[PDB]
Structures are given as C-alpha cells and as structure tokens.
Symmetry: D2
C-alpha cells in the first residue's frame, strides 16, 4: 500500500518562530527568578517592531527590551539590509496581570488539588520509525532548516539570511519509507548572489548533506526559492505571531493536535505541560515495547485538577490488550496539573531552547527520557 | 473497543475568535471592492486595544477603525462593565503591502500557471458520523457556544457576557457513539448573578437543549465555570490572536492538521483555499459512497502551481481500491491554486461568517456542497 | 493706556495634562527609589490607550501599568460612559535607556563639573501683581479649572466630567487691572443635564465663586460650552501628549518661554531645573524689592556645566541699576546644573503634584520660597 | 544698556521636527484632495517606529505608510547605521474622526459665522532688525541647521547624519547687535570621523560661512558636540513628538507665545491660522512704518467666530498713538476664523514646507507678504 505524506519546518529566523523564541525567552528569564510565576505571554512581530503582551503575574523583575533585542539579535537580524534589526527595531509592551478569577481555580489551598490552567485537549505521540521514537518527516524537515541556520552562522554561506522554510514529502509503501518524492527549501538571501548559484549551493551545503542519499533518486523533485526571488523576508515580508507553528512544533502532521500552543506559558498551563507529559508516556510505552506506535490524548477542565478524559490509541500495533495498557497509564503516571510538573520538573527556565526546531526529539529534554519503560514493562510480561 | 475522544469550541466572544472575526471582517470589506486583492491580515487583541496589521496590497479603500469597531460591537462588548468596548477601545494599524518577491511567484503571466501563495500542507476530512458528514464532537461543541451566544443576544439570559468556551467528551464503543462522559461549559457573567443559579441556568438554557438526552446519563459529569468565578473575560482576562483556533476551526482534533490558519487571508493563500478544497473532495467522496470516512492531504510549494503531494486515507473504510480512488481524485478536481478558486468561486466576501463556529458543517458554504458525488460515483460502479 | 490680555488653563482631566500627570507620576515613583535616576518620559494618550515611552536609565523597579491606571483613575475617568477608563484602557510602553553619548557629557568624574542635560534657553518671571508674585490672568484661570474639578469630586455637580478648559481676559488700564471683559469655561458633562441648566450652574458653582465680583460688570461676556454640546471629551475627543501645555504650565503668556517642557524629566534636565531656578531668582528679586517685575533668562549647552547666557529684564521697574542687579544674580545663585539641584533640592519625588494647575504660584514648592530676598537686599541699600 | 539674548534651532533630522514634518506631510496630502478637510494629526516617533494618530474627518483617501516612509526618507534616515530607516521602520496609526460635538461649533449654516476650532491665545511679531522683519537670533540659528543639512545632502560632509541642533547668543548693546558671545552646534555623525576633525570641519563648512564675520571675535566661544560624542541620534537617542518646537517654529523666544502648535492641523484651527494672521498684521504694521517692532495678540473661544481679545504692543516704538493703531487693526484685517483663511488663502497643501526651519521669515509664504502696509499707511499720515 503506497502513499505520500508531507511535513514542514521553519528556521529560527521565521517570523512566527521569532515570536515564540521571544515569548519563551521572557518566561525563562522570569522563571529563573521565580519558578512559581504565572506567565501567559503573547508576542506580535512586524516590519520594525516587536509587541510583547499578555498577562504575567510574578514577583520577578525583568527587562523586556533587553531580553527581546538580545533574543532577536541572536536569531540573526542585525542590519536594515536584512529587513529587521534587533538594535534599531521598536520594542512595545502591553503586559497585564493574570485574572484573579482564573487564579482561584488554579492555585488552591492544597498544592496537589491545584487545578488546570484552562480547559482543552492535548495529543501525545510516539513511533518506532526512528531512534528518538519520532516520525521521520518532521525529523528531517527540522534538520533542513537547522542546517541552513548553521551554515549561515558558521559563515559557510555568508549570503544566507535568517528567514527560511523547508518542506519534504516521503514515499510510504508497505507502511515504511521507500524514499522522498519532493523537496522544498526556501531561504532568504542577499542581493549579491544569483538564483542558480544559490540553488546549486543550497543542494551541496544544505540538502545533500542532510537527506539520506538512499531516499534520493532521479525521481525526487527539488523546489528551491520557487518565486525565483527571496531577498525580502522576516517581519517585513511576513507577520510573525506566537503559537502559529503548532504542528511543526510537534509531530509534523503525522499525529493529531488539540490546538494549544507552547511558547509563552508556564507549566501550570496544561496546553504545554499535559502535552509534554503525553509525549512522555507515548514514547515510554513504545520504548517499553508495549506498542509500535501510539497516540495519547488527555483533556482538562479549568480549575479542575483531575483530567476530564484520557485515551490511548495503538493502531492495533499494541502487544498487550489496550485494556491493561490503558489501566497501566493512569496507574504509572500522574496527569494532574501538580503531578506532571513534578513528574517532569517543569519549574525551570528550559523553554526558550524549545522554541525553534521541534519540542520533541531532543532526548535531553525531561519528557524525551524513557525511564518508566522498563518498569512499564514489568507491569506486563516482564521477561 | 471502548475509548474516549474530546473536542472543544469557543464563543464568538473569545479573544482569539474576536481577532479572526476582525481579520476576516477586513478581508471581506476589501474583497467586496476588489476580488483579486492580496490580503494577509493579522490581528492582535488585548485589554483596551485591537491591533490590525500584516501585509495588504489592494486597490480598494477601506476604513479599519469602522470595520473593527463595528465588528467588535456586533460581537457584544459595548461597555467597560464587560471589560472591552467597541466604542471606547483603541484601534491600531500596522499594515504594509505584500512583498513583490513573493508576488512574482504567485501572479504570473498566465493566470492558470499562477502559483501557490506559500509552501505547506493541508488536511481535508469527511465522515458519515453525521448528515453534514462532520465528526460529532466538534459539531456539538460548536452548538454549545453558539447557543450560549444566542440565549445572550435574545435576552433570555441577560447576565451572560460574550466570552465563553465549551468542551465535550464522547464515549466511543464499537467505533460508534454510546454517550457523553463529561461536559464543560465556561461563560463570562455579570456581578449580579450567583454561581449556583448560573450553573443551574446554563443547564436548562444551554446544555440540556443542545445535548441529545440519550447520550446524557447519571454518569455524565458537568463542569460549569470551575474556578468558581468568571466575571473578568475578553481581552482583559486573555490575549486574543489571529489563527490560534486552528483546530476548533476545522474538525475538533478528530482529523489531522498542517498548521495553516484561515482568517485574514485571500484565497490565493493555499492555507485557506487548498484546505477548503480538501474538505470538498473528502466530503464528496463519502457522499459518493466511495468510503465511510477519508482524510485528504495536499502540500504545496510557494510560487509553484502544481501540488507537491496528495494522499487519500480511507482507514480501510473504502469501497473501491484506493488506487482508482486516488487516480480519481486528481482526475475530477483541480488542486492548482487557480483551479480551486474557480472550483469554489472564492473571489467573494464570504469569510467573516466563517470566522466563528467552524469552517465546516455549514452546507451553504461552497465547499460543503456535494455535487461531484454522483459523478464521482459514475467513475466507479455507477448502478 | 488701556489694553486687553488673555490667559487660559486646563483641568487635570484634559488629555494633554493627563499625559503630563502620567509622565511625572512615573518619574516620582522612580525617584522615590533612586533620586539620581535619569528619566526622559514622554506619554501619548488617545481613545482607549496610554503610551508611556522615552528613555529611562535607573536602578529602580517600577510598575508602569499600575502607576498609569492609578494616575488616570485618580484624575477621574473610570467608566466607558466618560469615554476613557483607568481599569479597562490599554497601557503601552516603549521605554529604552538613555544614550551613553549624552550621558558622558552630563555625569562627569567631578559632580560639580557635571553638565547640562541639553542645550536650550529658559525664562523665569516674577511680578508684584499678586502676593505670590504671579501674574493675575494665569492665577484665576487655574483657579477656575481647579474649582470645576473640586466641585466635581466633592459631588456638588455630579454630572461634571474630568475634561475642562478655562479662558479669561483682563482689562488693563494704567498698567493695572480694572476688570474682566470675557470669561470662557468649557467642561465635559453627562447626557443627563441640559445646556441652560449647565451654564446657569457653572456660573453659580464655578465662575461666580472664583472671579472677584469687582472685576465682573454688566459688560463681561460669558462663554460656556459654546459649541452647545460637550458630552464627548477626554482622549476620545482630543489626543493628549506630554509637554503641550508649556504656557499654562508657566505664566499664561504674560512672560516669555524658551520651549522646554517640564513633566517626565529628572532635574538634570535644564528645561525643568533651570526653569525653576529662574522663577526662583525672579521671584526673589521682586520680593527683595529690587524691581516690580523682572524676567530672567538662562541658556545652556549640552555637556557643559557653565551657563551660555544670562540676562535680567526689569522693564525699567528696577530700583538698582541693572548693572549691579545682574552682577548680583550670578553672585548669589548657582545656575550650574549641579548647583541648582542642591540649591532647590530637586532629587525628590515632588513633581506629579506639579503636573496640573501650574508649576508656579504654590509657595510650598522649593522654587516659590523667598529666603534670599532679604539677603539679596543687603547686597544693595539694606536699610 | 548691554545684555545677552539666546535663541536656538533644530535640523530637519531632529526627532521632534521629524514628527512635525510627518504630521504636516499627512495634512497636505489630504488637503490636496480635500481643502475643507478637518485634520488634527499628532505624531509620536521613537527607535524603530512612527505613530501617526489623532482625529481626521475627510473625504480624501491617503496612504499614511507611504507618506510617512517617503517623508522620513527625504529627511535622511535610510540605514540602521544612522539609527532609523524609512524603509525598515514601523509605521503605526491611531486615527479616529473629529468629534461632532466640536464640529457643530466650527462649521455652522452660514460659512462666515463659522467658529474657532478651539479656545486659546496667539502671538504675532515683527521687528525692523532685519529685511524680513524677523528677529536676528532665530534667523541665524535656522540658517545654521539648514546649512548643516545642505552640506550633508550635497555630499560636502558625507559623514554628517540628519540629527542636529544649533544655539547662538547675541550681544545686545544700545538695543542693537554688537556681536555674538557663544555659538553652539551639535550634529550627529559617523563612527568614521574624529571629534577634532569634525569640530574643525564644522567651523569651516557650517559656522564660518553662516555667521557674519563682523560679529565673530576672539571673545566668541564655540561649543561643538560637547559630550564629546554624538554618533547615536534621531529617535534612538531622543523621542520625537509633534508640536514640541513651539518656539523655534516662531520667533526664537524674542516675542511671546500662547501655547498652540502648528503642524498637523488644518486652518480652521486658530492655533495655526490666527497665529499666521498675527505675524501678518505685525509685519505689515512695521512695513507700513507705523512702529519699529510690535507684538500682536488675539484670543478665541471654541465655536465662536468673533475674537475674544486683541491687543497690539509697540513697546513705545509706535509712530501713531496706539489708539488709532489698534482701531486700525480691526479696521483693516478680519481675524474671524472664516476671514483669515480667505485673507491668506489657507485651503491649500502648503504646510509640510513649513515644518522645518521656521514658520516665519520666508517671504513667499502668504503671511510673510506685505501688501497692506502702504494701505495701512494711507489710514495714517500717508505722505
Ligand atoms: N550626544 C549628543 N550631543 C549633542 N546633542 C545631542 C546628542 N544626543 C542627542 N542630541 C540632541 O538632543 C536633542 C534634544 O532635543 P530636545 O527636543 O530639546 O530635548 P527634550 O528633552 O525633548 N526637550 P524639549 O522638546 O525642548 O522639551 C535630540 O533630539 C538630539 O538632536
Ligand atoms: N465640545 C467641546 N466644547 C468645548 N471644549 C471642548 C470640546 N471638545 C473638546 N474640548 C476641549 O478642547 C481641548 C482642546 O485642547 P487643546 O490642547 O488646546 O487642542 P490642541 O489642538 O491640541 N492644541 P494645543 O495643545 O494647544 O496645541 C480638549 O482637550 C477638550 O478639553
Ligand atoms: C484560561 S484563559 C488563559 C489563561 C490566562 N492567560 C492565564 O493568565 O492563566 C483562556 C480562556 O478561558 C476563559 N476564561 C477566562 N477567565 C476564566 C475563568 N475565570 N473561568 C473559566 N474560563 C475563563 C476565556 O474565554 C479565556 O479566553
Ligand atoms: C509566503 S509568506 C506569507 C504570505 C504573505 N503574507 C503574503 O502577503 O502573501 C510565509 C513565509 O514564506 C517565506 N517567504 C517570504 N518571502 C518568500 C519568497 N519570496 N520566496 C519563498 N519564501 C518566502 C517566509 O519565511 C515567510 O514567513
Ligand atoms: C539631549 S536629548 C534630550 C534628553 C534625552 N531624552 C535624555 O535621555 O537625556
Ligand atoms: C477643541 S479640541 C482641539 C481640536 C481637535 N483635535 C479637533 O478634532 O478639532
Ligand atoms: K502572516
Ligand atoms: K492568550
Ligand atoms: K490634539
Ligand atoms: K524627548
Ligand atoms: Mg504565520
Ligand atoms: Mg487552550
Ligand atoms: Mg489563544
Ligand atoms: Mg503555511
Ligand atoms: Mg493639545
Ligand atoms: Mg529644547
Ligand atoms: Mg523634544
Ligand atoms: Mg491650546
């Protein structure tokens, strides 16, 4: 059974991502000073400005302009030549405090009883398609924009600009990868180099080194800067907003999604924490060998600590009747707001780093670790 | 095989939705004056302001303050008492023009060859779970917030405020719905009514009349304004942004998603047009009885007119080998940028109405129509 | 020799003044925490927002939103009914730090040598026309708006709104006041009261009690809310900006002005400190009886500690040849940046109070005191 | 009787002036399309943005971004190197419409009866110190910044940046100029040139060619970029705002001022039109030889067509008893709102040009013309 699946990714220089980075850059700074802070930060980015707003209630004292300018600076925009400049852009702020009405339902007398930051559903996912138990398409797309950024920073291709996007579509037969049909790579550049040169250079430096030569055949079709010109990019060519990369932030469209963004919010926000916890059990279940691939899904109710719903989907690839596989889940992990935070130790400034190139796949992240696997195994035919 | 699935929806009074409405309110206005306009409008909403920005290149002449004020006004916020007021709020604008670099790849000499507005992937979906071939969870959640809004406007529950959100989780056994385990309904209100009364009133007026009495049992759990207090809402309690309701806008998490928002963009933007066209064939395939449920997926490359990928997933529920089912797709429909726009006649101001309560399910929308079904049938065992 | 002279004033509810208040409100808060802070705060106010920006370099930690909301709150706008609301309006911030390039010229190794914050000229003034040695027209105009504000707060005229402006023109014959020809008083109000009533009420409560009955004759002409309707006011009816009440802030147009605003800046800013010091010597000279009225004028050069120009003008009313009168000035006072601040002890949070109803005329202000007079007398025919 | 008087000016690259230019640039554009438009445009400018706001009620259709970007572009900021860039900066808009409440008092049935845009007082001035009957100090200071700008644009001193300010103080003995004591000239520059070179260059190219060599003696003191470094300037180093150059816009502090700004407002605004009409009669009086120097002052009441106050001050230099000189004023000119506009034909886009380097002194401006002089002479001892 043959079929085609497509995924995509964006460079750290992409408007939307710039936002996320900024958003999560502020939270980290804040958290460093106060772990129990409540941060709901939304960032808007355009031509010559950066808007950092939302609701933040913390005892910490931070500098938004500095965190912002520095964050963009690192991204790469440092001259009007590229369209945006950390040093000369505007930095606006419209940050209020979190509504007490919401807060009474979140932070209650007893810390354990403390409730979900909001209502909603989240999807977790894992697959044995790769070592990091992540789907392949998203993994390679991420690698593509990441490479472009590194070949830019190291000065290999000095004419590359921050803004860039990547798309790849794999060939799936017998349910496994047989190759790659089409490759898309768009990257901002200087008025100094020509399309052909650029195209030819992108192949050698960015695509050829990242895509497995086996999956590349005379069939594969390459799309490099199709409009034929990408000199204008960044916020000037496209408005950047927080939480608009929901899918590339997760599993590339392979798995499902509930609609909750990650960047800008502290862990008491189930959108981010319950999501991480979901990748945590899903991955751990597959590592435990209880299934080849499984999608998990939890849903919550604001101010309520106990999950409103949970469901594990193994697409038949399970090895123990879902029954015990589902009774095992709530048995081993605590999906209650104030259970996942301890479970993954989320009270730390570790999110900025998570704002570009996927929230999953980086084994050093607390939710990528698989310690519960072997124990999740004991609970079912150890041996 | 039993399992639980959860979906959610938001009222037209929800911050994020306010943005979308505004965003799509501007495009419509513009389009009315110029159908071939290029509108990429992003809106940011908070406590006392509304930020309309992005890139717009049109020959039309519109008034952002008026479209905005009027759009919010209709939503409901017209007094400081509710936290936001169309008449007294601030209306900011940061709207530039579309980058010529992008444009050269979109609008080419030959209109047919005209390319995709951007790279990316989109997911279409259909299911025989309901008459409108839409999943059930998203359909009832939408109905819940929609009811709340109507009971508010008609004056049945005058103490209701615009801001509201709804969550419902269904019981799925044997792959069909058996009932509903938990119901969540959060709505903003006045300082005049008490929780109990409120709760009791929400049940009679909003939940009881909308949820099928069959699926409601003594088991069902109801979560009404859990924090115990929701008097503060709207942009004051939560920052609103365009395109952050990606999932409730589509299929509630039942189907997949690529990451493209809808509101604020003209049809030359595949994020909205290829998405619509995808719901179109998926629905049309099920209506054609070629499958009980199928997910479609297309992906594009900026400046390129021909789709980079297409894939139909029928989850085995297909009735004709996928083979002919996939060769039929590209046979009957034109997924090229300037083929879907004619296919669905997208050059009209018909989007604002699509900004609240789902983009799918409203049979009067051009993509909800199923005319190609019977003909899609002829191409496979007519009879 | 008869002639007419007109002056005007504005309520604390006037858009421009709102800005000022806000601007100086931020400074005070900062200064309280750090007296040697460098504050250059500019505020922009419109329909539903408040923009606090400029350059601030301090070690203090303050909350702009709180200071702002509270400052507007106190002014009076607390409902959408009045057009603006401290609780529901937007608060934006674009505050960067002071340029080091300016700083090196201001704060030098030796504190005494420390230079002027900028180049410019300032005008001081004093007149025996009144006990507080202030001109009369500006004194009564201030009193008018101040009364309206007090009759509003105390609940005497509950239908009065914050926004209001006052204009008075005196009759000057033989160089002295003989009466008042025309009176102007514009005040915002509620949709509840009628013009006539309002007008009739404004006379009894605000004008009649404030203007000396002697100067009021059957000739005087009263202009009360001329357009016939002033229900819409505040930032909604008129954009408020910092430093746009330069004249009512000083002497009502009777004396001269160099163009430097007061609110929003710390004392190292000669626009404010040299100005104050100028009223100080001019007042002190008249109190010392060396002249009936004299205008002083100093000018500075950025980064330069020693004044670029000084000139005393006594309009012939002097009693000691200007010569010794000018040599006495630089003899008694220190107009060097770091001499006037000590001279008047300006490193304290005492400016917000100065943001409405005149910077001069309040004898409790450090620059209104006349201690040097008697000593300024000894230096010239004591007896 | 010796004494010192100081005045100052600012380049078209000064933040405040940038605002004014922008503000008056929008009006002209509008007016070009609709002369009877009502424009009250206030601009705020900082680091990477430009805020155009206020209240505008016109039938005209204009592009703020374009007018703005182009206006800044012409000023000179076109690279992040200089701190601001017309191409890459942000352009924001908060423009509402004029309050109808104000309007009913302005535009009434009979166009003649039409009322003053607001209340307030304005000062006109003329002096025989120079051919254009302007005071000397302000004339030379303007020339200084204007020269710097020209030596920058023509490429003479390519390392000069737009931002610059100038200060000059004249020696006045026997009531006439004897020379100049101190000269101040601050200009932004590139990291490429040194202070000494710069200073030495500024003297040859900007000061020496502009200041009369007669007035320059070994006594004169020159202050050139005192802080020792001015590389950072423009909105980055200092916040720009509309109407904050009230004094350099007029007479340099030699004459009086009422507090009304010029830029951003249409002629129905007495702040600008009554101001111009006042320079018109004052200049015309001196030209008519009725006095060596005279200050005029009018005051108005909103919605009221007939001036609330008028007074002419000739400082004894009059040649006809003030009496007939004052009865002549209201005899010859019409200071009613709808009389001055026809008097000077103000319904035209001629203001941008007036936003930098003084509103008076340019004999080609309608208010600089002296046609009524000879006729103002006939009315008093013709011969
Ligand atoms: N290093 C520097 N050396 C000399 N002049 C400078 C330097 N940096 C900035 N300036 C100038 O300082 C100007 C200050 O203008 P000014 O408008 O008078 O300041 P202000 O505090 O805003 N006061 P005002 O508008 O008069 O109330 C800036 O706009 C620059 O032209
Ligand atoms: N209907 C009305 N009747 C009378 N006064 C009004 C009315 N509407 C508004 N006003 C007042 O008009 C004021 C105008 O202030 P003003 O600041 O002098 O205007 P401006 O054009 O901004 N000029 P300025 O700052 O002096 O250059 C407003 O802020 C209100 O206090
Ligand atoms: C829970 S809020 C987002 C979290 C918030 N930004 C914070 O600071 O934690 C998201 C949505 O919940 C709803 N909401 C706001 N206040 C609420 C309350 N007290 N109880 C229930 N729902 C509420 C609104 O519709 C709002 O858009
Ligand atoms: C195609 S743009 C969005 C469409 C745009 N708002 C418009 O007005 O049509 C989205 C992303 O594509 C990339 N992009 C911008 N200009 C491009 C170009 N000329 N060629 C290819 N990709 C480009 C950027 O990374 C940008 O964030
Ligand atoms: C010498 S420019 C005017 C003052 C400037 N705002 C500052 O920060 O000091
Ligand atoms: C009398 S308020 C000052 C003028 C106001 N901006 C207007 O729109 O006319
Ligand atoms: K966008
Ligand atoms: K939010
Ligand atoms: K104004
Ligand atoms: K400033
Ligand atoms: Mg985006
Ligand atoms: Mg959510
Ligand atoms: Mg949201
Ligand atoms: Mg996309
Ligand atoms: Mg004003
Ligand atoms: Mg100044
Ligand atoms: Mg200034
Ligand atoms: Mg005024």
């Amino acid at each position: 059974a043959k079929h085609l699946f497509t995924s995509e990714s964006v460079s750290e220089g992409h408007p939307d991502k710039i936002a996320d980075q900024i958003s999560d850059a502020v939270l980290d700074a804040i958290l460093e000073q106060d772990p129990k802070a409540r941060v709901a930060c939304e960032t808007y980015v355009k031509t010559g400005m950066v808007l950092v707003g939302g609701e933040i209630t913390t005892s910490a004292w931070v500098d938004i302009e500095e965190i912002t300018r520095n964050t963009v600076r690192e991204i790469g925009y440092v001259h009007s030549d590229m369209g945006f400049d950390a040093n000369s852009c505007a930095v606006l702020s419209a940050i209020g405090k979190q509504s007490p009405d919401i807060n009474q339902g979140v932070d209650r007398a007893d810390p354990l009883e403390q409730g979900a930051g909001d209502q909603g559903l989240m999807f977790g996912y894992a697959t044995n398609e790769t070592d990091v138990l992540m789907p392949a398409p998203i993994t390679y797309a991420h690698r593509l924009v990441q490479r472009q950024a590194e070949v830019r920073k190291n000065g290999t291709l000095p004419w590359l600009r921050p803004d860039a996007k990547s798309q790849v579509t794999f060939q799936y037969d017998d349910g496994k990868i047989v190759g790659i049909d089409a490759v898309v790579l768009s990257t901002q550049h200087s008025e100094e180099i020509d399309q052909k040169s650029l195209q030819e250079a992108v192949m050698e430096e960015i695509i050829k080194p990242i895509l497995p030569a086996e999956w590349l055949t005379s069939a594969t079709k390459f799309f490099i800067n199709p409009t034929g010109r990408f000199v204008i990019g960044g916020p000037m060519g496209d408005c950047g907003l927080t939480g608009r990369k929901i899918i590339v932030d997760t599993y590339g469209g392979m798995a499902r999604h509930g609609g909750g963004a990650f960047s800008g919010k502290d862990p008491s926000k189930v959108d981010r924490s319950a999501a991480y916890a979901a990748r945590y059990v899903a991955k751990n279940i597959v590592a435990a060998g209880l299934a080849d691939r499984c999608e998990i899904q939890v849903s919550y109710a604001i101010g309520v600590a106990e999950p409103t719903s949970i469901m594990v989907e193994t697409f038949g690839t399970e090895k123990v009747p879902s029954e015990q596989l589902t009774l095992l889940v709530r048995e081993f992990f605590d999906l209650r707001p104030y259970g996942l935070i301890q479970m993954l130790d989320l009270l730390h400034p570790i999110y900025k780093e998570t704002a570009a190139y996927g929230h999953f796949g980086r084994e050093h992240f607390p939710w990528e670790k698989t310690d519960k696997a072997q124990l999740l195994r004991d609970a079912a035919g150890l041996k």
